[PDB]
């Protein structure tokens, strides 16, 4: 994946170096567009956004009192 950002200034690459992913069957790195692994955009957006709210809610709590 790193090479997708390293060679981007060229706009012409040996490979796009994007849409590569983990093959959970054979244990190799494969292209997900050619392999067929797609995920919703709204899902990854909502996950990452809600993940911040979860982390902030915990990090914000600096005192606990028991009555």
């Amino acid at each position: 994946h790193a090479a997708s950002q390293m060679a981007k200034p060229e706009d012409v690459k040996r490979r796009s170096y994007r849409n590569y992913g983990l093959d959970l069957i054979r244990g190799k790195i494969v292209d997900e567009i050619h392999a067929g692994v797609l995920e919703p955009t709204i899902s990854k957006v909502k996950s990452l956004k809600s993940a911040l709210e979860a982390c902030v809610a915990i990090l914000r709590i600096d005192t606990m009192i028991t009555v």
Partner: peptide, 19 residues
């Protein structure tokens, strides 16, 4: 010292377990 952390819009939150 319990409330000292709560001042400001960036303030820290306090957890209170009630009876």
């Amino acid at each position: 010292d319990a409330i000292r952390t709560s001042l400001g819009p960036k303030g820290m939150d306090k957890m209170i377990k009630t009876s």
